[PDB]
Amino acid sequence: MKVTKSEIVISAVKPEQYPEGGLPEIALAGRSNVGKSSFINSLINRKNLAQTLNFYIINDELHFVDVPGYGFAKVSKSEREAWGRMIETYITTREELKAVVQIVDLRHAPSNDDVQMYEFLKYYGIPVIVIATKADKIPKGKWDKHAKVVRQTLNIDPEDELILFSSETKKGKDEAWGAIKKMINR
């Protein structure tokens, strides 16, 4: 998978605004927006391409759907409910959705917010690709230890992949693309 084309398509809040075409969709979720944008840019060899669902068309073959971060400590109950109607409407009605990539940090245990998001996604039976980032900051000899902390914290389902990733060395980029293709062609 070589990304020869990527552009933003729309920032939508309701189904009437989701793009047409029936191309498969991969949504991306993370506790933080900055980290999430960073991951998306590294997947498509860009630095600047990445409350609304932001759709991006990639190689005219799929859309990435950027879900606003789920870190709610400082978000009003009201905005939380609105985020809830927005994401739940998308997940339950979007036929195109094939998997969600959930982004977490390899360096430390996932937060309860990451755990709750993972639980919420599995309740709906959506395949999840868990990406543990910042792998370049951890010595290789400790990768397995850090992976295990992520896996055991989230209690990853045996059918879901855990991929260690670095936006700097591009470690896990081919693999992430591989799992994305597996989900889009099922």
Residue ranges of domains in the chain: 1-186
Structure tokens, 81:
């409910």
The answer to whether 101 is a known ligand-binding residue is: no
Using CA atoms, how far residue 111 sits from 117, 119, 121, 152, in Å, is: 10, 13, 16, 12
Is 146 in contact with 107 (CB distance < 8 Å)?
yes
**DSSP string for 63-117:** EEEE------TTS-HHHHHHHHHHHHHHHHH-TTEEEEEEEEETTSPPPHHHHHH
3-state secondary structure of 62: strand
How far is it, in rounded angstroms, from Cα 149 to Cα 156?
Answer: 11
The answer to whether 22 is a known ligand-binding residue is: no
Cα Rg, the chain, nearest whole Å = 16
Taken as a whole, the chain contains a residue count of 186
Which of 162, 163, 183, 161 is CA-nearest to residue 174?
163
Residue 163 host element (H or E): strand 161-164
Structure tokens, 1:
């998978």
The answer to whether 136 is a known ligand-binding residue is: yes
Q: What single-letter amino acid sits at 12?
A: A
Is 108 in contact with 154 (CB distance < 8 Å)?
no
Using CA atoms, how far residue 5 sits from 33, 47, 56, 61, in Å, is: 23, 14, 10, 10
The answer to whether 65 is a known ligand-binding residue is: no
1-186: which CATH number, 3.40.50.300, 3.60.40.10, 3.40.30.10, 3.40.50.2300?
Answer: 3.40.50.300
The answer to whether 102 is a known ligand-binding residue is: no
| Technique used by the depositors | X-ray
CB neighbours of residue 168 within 10 Å = 12
Structure tokens, 74:
């400082």
How far is it, in rounded angstroms, from Cα 71 to Cα 117?
Answer: 10
Q: Which residue has the tokens 């960073």?
A: 38
3-state secondary structure of 24: coil
The answer to whether 33 is a known ligand-binding residue is: yes
The answer to whether 30 is a known ligand-binding residue is: yes
